[PDB]
Enzyme design. Structure first.
Site, PDB file in Angstrom:
ATOM      1  N   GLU A  44      33.710   3.716 -22.174  1.00  0.00           N
ATOM      2  CA  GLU A  44      33.743   4.555 -23.322  1.00  0.00           C
ATOM      3  C   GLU A  44      32.827   5.797 -23.430  1.00  0.00           C
ATOM      4  OE1 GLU A  44      34.105   2.305 -27.297  1.00  0.00           O
ATOM      5  OE2 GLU A  44      34.711   0.648 -25.965  1.00  0.00           O
ATOM      6  N   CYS A  65      22.302  -0.689 -11.470  1.00  0.00           N
ATOM      7  CA  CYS A  65      22.328  -2.150 -11.076  1.00  0.00           C
ATOM      8  C   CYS A  65      21.538  -2.287  -9.986  1.00  0.00           C
ATOM      9  CB  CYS A  65      23.817  -2.431 -10.637  1.00  0.00           C
ATOM     10  SG  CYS A  65      24.190  -1.222  -9.031  1.00  0.00           S
ATOM     11  N   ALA A 106      21.594   3.822  -2.662  1.00  0.00           N
ATOM     12  CA  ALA A 106      22.288   3.246  -1.454  1.00  0.00           C
ATOM     13  C   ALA A 106      23.494   4.531  -1.093  1.00  0.00           C
ATOM     14  CB  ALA A 106      23.246   2.202  -1.498  1.00  0.00           C
ATOM     15  N   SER A 148      28.949  -5.412 -16.340  1.00  0.00           N
ATOM     16  CA  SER A 148      28.064  -6.423 -16.704  1.00  0.00           C
ATOM     17  C   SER A 148      28.510  -7.694 -16.180  1.00  0.00           C
ATOM     18  CB  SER A 148      28.053  -6.599 -18.109  1.00  0.00           C
ATOM     19  OG  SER A 148      29.291  -6.851 -18.647  1.00  0.00           O
ATOM     20  N   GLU A 163      31.735  -6.451  -9.419  1.00  0.00           N
ATOM     21  CA  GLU A 163      30.558  -6.129  -9.144  1.00  0.00           C
ATOM     22  C   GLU A 163      29.648  -6.085 -10.039  1.00  0.00           C
ATOM     23  OE1 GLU A 163      30.021  -6.045  -5.414  1.00  0.00           O
ATOM     24  OE2 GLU A 163      31.859  -7.047  -5.542  1.00  0.00           O
ATOM     25  N   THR A 164      28.683  -6.752 -10.377  1.00  0.00           N
ATOM     26  CA  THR A 164      28.064  -7.212 -11.359  1.00  0.00           C
ATOM     27  C   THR A 164      26.485  -6.866 -11.485  1.00  0.00           C
ATOM     28  OG1 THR A 164      27.768  -9.549 -10.823  1.00  0.00           O
ATOM     29  CG2 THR A 164      29.724  -8.914 -12.379  1.00  0.00           C
ATOM     30  N   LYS A 208      40.629   2.609 -16.251  1.00  0.00           N
ATOM     31  CA  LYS A 208      39.883   2.548 -17.386  1.00  0.00           C
ATOM     32  C   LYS A 208      38.616   2.985 -17.297  1.00  0.00           C
ATOM     33  CE  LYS A 208      37.915   0.574 -20.323  1.00  0.00           C
ATOM     34  NZ  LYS A 208      36.936   0.922 -21.222  1.00  0.00           N
ATOM     35  N   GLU A 267      19.015  -9.147 -17.171  1.00  0.00           N
ATOM     36  CA  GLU A 267      18.897  -7.734 -16.990  1.00  0.00           C
ATOM     37  C   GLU A 267      18.843  -6.806 -18.292  1.00  0.00           C
ATOM     38  OE1 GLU A 267      23.017  -5.684 -15.462  1.00  0.00           O
ATOM     39  OE2 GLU A 267      21.907  -4.865 -14.013  1.00  0.00           O
ATOM     40  N   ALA A 282      35.498   0.624 -15.228  1.00  0.00           N
ATOM     41  CA  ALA A 282      34.387   1.138 -14.649  1.00  0.00           C
ATOM     42  C   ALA A 282      33.416   1.422 -15.503  1.00  0.00           C
ATOM     43  CB  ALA A 282      34.708   2.600 -14.097  1.00  0.00           C
TER      44      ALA A 282
HETATM   45  N1  LIG Z   1      27.288  -3.977  -9.008  1.00  0.00           N
HETATM   46  C1  LIG Z   1      27.334  -2.833  -9.061  1.00  0.00           C
HETATM   47  O1  LIG Z   1      27.846  -2.150  -8.021  1.00  0.00           O
HETATM   48  C2  LIG Z   1      27.317  -2.312 -10.465  1.00  0.00           C
HETATM   49  C3  LIG Z   1      27.325  -0.552 -10.452  1.00  0.00           C
HETATM   50  C4  LIG Z   1      27.270  -0.258 -11.723  1.00  0.00           C
HETATM   51  C5  LIG Z   1      26.729  -0.942 -12.842  1.00  0.00           C
HETATM   52  N2  LIG Z   1      26.937  -2.333 -12.741  1.00  0.00           N
HETATM   53  C6  LIG Z   1      26.597  -3.073 -13.868  1.00  0.00           C
HETATM   54  O2  LIG Z   1      27.451  -2.582 -15.163  1.00  0.00           O
HETATM   55  C7  LIG Z   1      26.706  -2.654 -16.072  1.00  0.00           C
HETATM   56  C8  LIG Z   1      26.528  -1.473 -17.069  1.00  0.00           C
HETATM   57  O3  LIG Z   1      27.715  -0.875 -17.386  1.00  0.00           O
HETATM   58  P1  LIG Z   1      28.744  -1.346 -18.668  1.00  0.00           P
HETATM   59  O4  LIG Z   1      27.728  -1.271 -19.710  1.00  0.00           O
HETATM   60  O5  LIG Z   1      29.606   0.017 -18.648  1.00  0.00           O
HETATM   61  O6  LIG Z   1      29.146  -2.701 -18.554  1.00  0.00           O
HETATM   62  P2  LIG Z   1      30.329  -3.468 -19.223  1.00  0.00           P
HETATM   63  O7  LIG Z   1      29.799  -3.671 -20.683  1.00  0.00           O
HETATM   64  O8  LIG Z   1      30.562  -4.909 -18.487  1.00  0.00           O
HETATM   65  O9  LIG Z   1      31.650  -2.627 -19.185  1.00  0.00           O
HETATM   66  C9  LIG Z   1      32.174  -2.217 -18.100  1.00  0.00           C
HETATM   67  C10 LIG Z   1      33.593  -1.627 -18.313  1.00  0.00           C
HETATM   68  O10 LIG Z   1      34.476  -2.927 -18.750  1.00  0.00           O
HETATM   69  C11 LIG Z   1      35.172  -2.771 -19.622  1.00  0.00           C
HETATM   70  N3  LIG Z   1      35.150  -3.975 -20.452  1.00  0.00           N
HETATM   71  C12 LIG Z   1      34.252  -4.423 -21.565  1.00  0.00           C
HETATM   72  N4  LIG Z   1      34.794  -5.548 -21.763  1.00  0.00           N
HETATM   73  C13 LIG Z   1      35.808  -6.014 -21.307  1.00  0.00           C
HETATM   74  C14 LIG Z   1      36.801  -7.041 -21.341  1.00  0.00           C
HETATM   75  N5  LIG Z   1      36.529  -8.290 -21.769  1.00  0.00           N
HETATM   76  N6  LIG Z   1      37.870  -6.815 -20.272  1.00  0.00           N
HETATM   77  C15 LIG Z   1      38.046  -5.931 -19.427  1.00  0.00           C
HETATM   78  N7  LIG Z   1      37.128  -4.569 -19.540  1.00  0.00           N
HETATM   79  C16 LIG Z   1      36.098  -4.790 -20.460  1.00  0.00           C
HETATM   80  C17 LIG Z   1      34.100  -1.653 -20.396  1.00  0.00           C
HETATM   81  O11 LIG Z   1      34.899  -1.017 -21.598  1.00  0.00           O
HETATM   82  P3  LIG Z   1      34.285  -0.382 -22.785  1.00  0.00           P
HETATM   83  O12 LIG Z   1      33.456   0.863 -22.389  1.00  0.00           O
HETATM   84  O13 LIG Z   1      35.288   0.060 -23.661  1.00  0.00           O
HETATM   85  O14 LIG Z   1      33.283  -1.411 -23.284  1.00  0.00           O
HETATM   86  C18 LIG Z   1      33.847  -0.890 -19.289  1.00  0.00           C
HETATM   87  O15 LIG Z   1      34.917   0.094 -18.975  1.00  0.00           O
HETATM   88  C19 LIG Z   1      25.228  -3.297 -15.829  1.00  0.00           C
HETATM   89  O16 LIG Z   1      25.069  -4.716 -15.780  1.00  0.00           O
HETATM   90  C20 LIG Z   1      25.135  -2.766 -14.458  1.00  0.00           C
HETATM   91  O17 LIG Z   1      24.234  -3.597 -13.551  1.00  0.00           O
HETATM   92  C21 LIG Z   1      27.022  -2.868 -11.564  1.00  0.00           C
END
Ligand SMILES: NC(=O)c1ccc[n+]([C@@H]2O[C@H](COP(=O)([O-])OP(=O)(O)OC[C@H]3O[C@@H](n4cnc5c(N)ncnc54)[C@H](OP(=O)(O)O)[C@@H]3O)[C@@H](O)[C@H]2O)c1
Ligand SMILES: NC(=O)c1ccc[n+]([C@@H]2O[C@H](COP(=O)([O-])OP(=O)(O)OC[C@H]3O[C@@H](n4cnc5c(N)ncnc54)[C@H](OP(=O)(O)O)[C@@H]3O)[C@@H](O)[C@H]2O)c1
Ligand code: NA
Ligand code: NA
Lengths: 516, 516
Positions: free
Chosen positions: A210, A322, A478, A261, A288-289, A207, A417, A181
């Site tokens: 952080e 997002c 939404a 991301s 969902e990115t 999970k 982004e 998440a």
């Molecule tokens: N499309 C949608 O509905 C939606 C909704 C909300 C947010 N988002 C997107 O989410 C992003 C912001 O959230 P974020 O910064 O939390 O994203 P993130 O850096 O991608 O992290 C998301 C989750 O993935 C974990 N993670 C990081 N690297 C990983 C790996 N290699 N394997 C498995 N899990 C891993 C992170 O853990 P850690 O925290 O320990 O790094 C965190 O729990 C933005 O790009 C936003 O657009 C999309």
């Protein structure tokens, strides 16, 4: 099961004295609770570890909101065993019984609403209304999925009859999966991604991000109080690139539910396509990115209405959505009138500690601040900076609402982004060019059009290629049930949250024939 | 569009003189045309190539049944251009218009039933009823998907209303994709995998199996006469590991619809999880792979009924079915009675040239012959050979119905898909052990139980973990609409063919809100 028809949980605006009083008390009690430690939750019990995760207050990062235990491989294994053991019996609960459990969890969450909102304020820097929206959305996911799950109950499939036979097709849950998440909606999306799969008989290892581990733990306090059987839901705060990847890659993980991301989503989708040694299924991965979301305004629009909606969409929760408008595409006749109104509105936005209920709190972390400031430097050499573009004074991660104009459609700040309070304004000739520019990114999440011209609106309905499109209103927020949420292209796999279709993702079908 | 409710196309039994006469006539016409060459079909026209593919009669492999053109990368590119160009307008057809096109194709196919059946007889060595079942299934897919597609028509999604707004969610097709098909049901599965995606507005590039390129071309003659717009369906006979892989890995391929071996399915699913350079979406890949399907018989069963159903399931189309019974699991009380009846029945099966309507024709190719004979050698070291296990006399790939007994559950012949007329018999203590043995393979496609004991049948309904389960009848021949077809585990992604759910796999959802 017979309950009232689904309705969305009202979002609190804090205009009444009663609401302000309740929120002040909730904020005070959460603040007084700073430094609390929350263990893992595995197999129905809270389990501590030697190592810990630290969660800071982004409005004052010297302040520790709380700490949690830290899940490594051993804890991941323990959670896997608990989840698979639980699945064996949880899958056989009547749907009515599982749905009642969700409804109990929603009632408990509703009673803890102000506390959870206050925790969002301090832990991730949401102002009061952004916090209320997040918790209300979480409650909505539980209420909605509880009801939607009943639509899949034994035996739900419409089949063609055959002489002399019973033919019965039905859905069954998949197994134990991992939910990974984001920090930006750490009550809503965390809850939704867990309870959807669980409602229909899956078990989950969750999970949290952080930066949002404390509020994740409080959601688990609710799950525990509701009485989910041991192993059905498990809480594993830890490092995504370590324990998250470990679970993603594991041969005994059945599905992966990810929001985050694009960079991480790509790695997860690729890993899910691989057969790990000893794996006996094709993993399902829902990812969902991000988005690079645009609002188009043409010369027929209500310019004041447009400017307000753009400012809300661009700067709500500091642009850390997002769904946030990070692009404003203006036809030639709309350019000056809309930009001037957007600048006037945006320069009036307050920025400060989230507890003060400002228009904008801080961005979530030092690293997020660094990234947003980096993109501002890139932007200075791509477009014309016309507002903000600076870190503000203070310990907290405060960034001013920022506007670049005359931005080339293919500029980095028009394609990538940024996830901060940074709007890129692009000037185009007409509506056709507006749509071309809107569509020309790798993403496809949200979009909007302000226009009074019916033909432009209906054209956009057909051709503005985003999963969630909005006309003459904001493009964020939404609502569960109302606007199935999810995108196209590199915005993910189009898993539509808050929609009947979401639950089908976590089921497989069996067909059983008896010849009499 | 209002048409009669769906019914399955009757499978011809050839019990009448007229039916036999009609078949002999069709066999004569088909063989008079053995000299024919069939080009590729790209962008609404037949397009030839320098290189060719040759198709042989497996009952007489020195006899060529036809040749086709051979698609390489350049032809793959031309088909991709045609398919994307067609998609731009095909996606905008009213569903009723697309559904009518399918119904026209079904009517044309029905008029050519005997010709297609005779082509199956000569090209892939189906006996007459196997051939008729295949063609009837193809017609069924067209009729069923034409009707099912209307269930998704604009705007199909049930959403929660909101004050002062219209909220409208609806489905749209994905784009151009690739269909990669097997030789064992080269009319039915080839047709189903193409027309399902096409019905709802996708466009398709179809790659038939090398052993079945002629009958695939005849299916395209039908599509051409039906009048699918140029580029909507494209025919690319060629080498799977070459042109097939090229399309699977291509950045501009939107989805992959595959039916075939697990080995190939694993490669496809892994490739589909990768972002090819310049790719702008997460690829969808549906992979329906093999089975290691068991029939359980307990001591309460009608042993004569069981024996007949086992022989039909094991040896129909020479065991070359993903659904074929390759394991026979007998409880101690059932063992001798059922085994003696199975042996008596199986020893009476005829094997010879498919056109003579034997119980078994040949296996499909020299390569398949080699594989099946190799597994017979492995079986000799694992179990007890009690029937057959021999190549029979003639140029044709004739293999005798084969039975191994006292086979250990973890033996290679009890675990791996042989895809030939080879049945492994496994003795177990009781029904509990029967289910344990049934479940303990990497697969989960079809299964059966012969038993009069209600508790055993209902236990199996809950715990025999296969996608298509049958009680007191054969486990092959799933009917479109009646028995949604698809498996669990390494039998694939559970894309249920001949079910309403199938078409959803080829759609994404948009949500559009207008605030008035
Ligand atoms: N499309 C949608 O509905 C939606 C909704 C909300 C947010 N988002 C997107 O989410 C992003 C912001 O959230 P974020 O910064 O939390 O994203 P993130 O850096 O991608 O992290 C998301 C989750 O993935 C974990 N993670 C990081 N690297 C990983 C790996 N290699 N394997 C498995 N899990 C891993 C992170 O853990 P850690 O925290 O320990 O790094 C965190 O729990 C933005 O790009 C936003 O657009 C999309
Ligand atoms: N689950 C189901 O509904 C179902 C139904 C029918 C059959 N099957 C399975 O199909 C198998 C027998 O069919 P088959 O022998 O035709 O299977 P196959 O060897 O896997 O070939 C299937 C198709 O894939 C192509 N292909 C081969 N390698 C490829 C690659 N690396 N990349 C892309 N395409 C590739 C083949 O082309 P070439 O002909 O040029 O090699 C053919 O068109 C059995 O395992 C059976 O159980 C499953
Ligand atoms: Na924090
Ligand atoms: Na052939």
């Amino acid at each position: 099961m017979t309950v009232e028809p689904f309705r969305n949980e009202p979002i609190e605006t804090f205009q009444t004295e009663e609401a302000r009083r309740a929120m002040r008390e909730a904020l005070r009690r959460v603040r007084e609770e700073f430094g609390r430690h929350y263990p893992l939750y595995i197999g129905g019990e809270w389990v501590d570890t030697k190592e810990r995760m630290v969660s800071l207050n982004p409005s004052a990062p010297s302040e520790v909101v709380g700490t949690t235990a830290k899940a490594g491989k051993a804890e991941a294994e323990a959670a896997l065993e608990a989840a698979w053991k639980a699945f064996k019996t949880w899958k056989d609960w009547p749907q009515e019984d599982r749905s009642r459990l969700l409804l109990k969890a929603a009632a408990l969450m509703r009673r803890r609403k102000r506390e959870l909102e206050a925790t969002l304020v301090y832990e991730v820097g949401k102002n009061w209304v952004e916090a209320s929206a997040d918790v209300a959305e979480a409650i909505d996911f539980i209420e909605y999925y509880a009801r939607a799950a009943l639509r899949y109950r034994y035996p739900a499939v419409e089949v063609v009859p055959y002489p002399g036979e019973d033919n019965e097709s039905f859905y069954v849950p998949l197994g134990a999966g991992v939910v990974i998440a984001p920090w930006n909606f750490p009550v809503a999306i965390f809850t939704g991604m867990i309870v959807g799969p669980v409602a229909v008989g899956n078990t989950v290892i969750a999970k949290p991000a952080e930066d949002a581990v404390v509020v994740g733990a409080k959601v688990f306090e609710i799950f525990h109080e509701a009485g989910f059987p041991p192993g059905v839901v498990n809480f594993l705060p830890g490092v995504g690139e370590e324990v998250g990847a470990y679970l993603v890659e594991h041969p005994r993980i059945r599905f992966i539910n990810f929001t985050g991301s694009l960079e991480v989503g790509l790695k997860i989708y690729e890993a899910a396509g691989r057969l790990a040694p000893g794996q006996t299924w094709f993993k399902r991965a829902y990812v969902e990115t991000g988005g690079k979301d645009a609002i188009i305004v043409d010369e027929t629009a209500d310019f004041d209405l447009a400017a307000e909606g753009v400012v809300v969409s661009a700067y709500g929760f500091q642009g850390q959505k997002c769904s946030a408008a990070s692009r404003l595409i203006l036809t030639q006749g709309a350019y000056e009138p809309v930009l001037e109104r957007v600048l006037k509105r945006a320069e009036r936005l307050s920025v400060g500690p989230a507890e003060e209920n400002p228009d904008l709190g801080p961005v979530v972390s030092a690293e997020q601040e660094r990234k947003v400031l980096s993109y501002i430097e890139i932007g200075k050499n791509e477009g014309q900076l016309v507002l903000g573009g600076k870190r503000l004074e203070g310990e907290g991660y405060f960034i001013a609402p920022t506007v670049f104009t005359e931005v080339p459609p293919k500029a980095r700040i028009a394609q990538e982004e940024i996830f901060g309070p940074v709007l890129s304004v692009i000037r185009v000739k007409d509506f056709a060019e507006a749509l071309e520019v809107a569509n020309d990114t790798p993403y496809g999440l949200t979009g909007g059009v302000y226009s009074r011209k019916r033909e432009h609106l209906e054209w956009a309905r057909r051709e503005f290629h985003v999963g969630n499109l909005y006309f003459n209103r904001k493009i964020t927020g939404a609502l569960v049930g109302v606007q199935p949420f999810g995108g196209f292209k590199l915005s993910g796999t189009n898993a539509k949250t808050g929609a009947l279709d979401y639950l089908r993702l976590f089921l497989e079908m069996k067909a059983v024939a008896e010849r009499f």
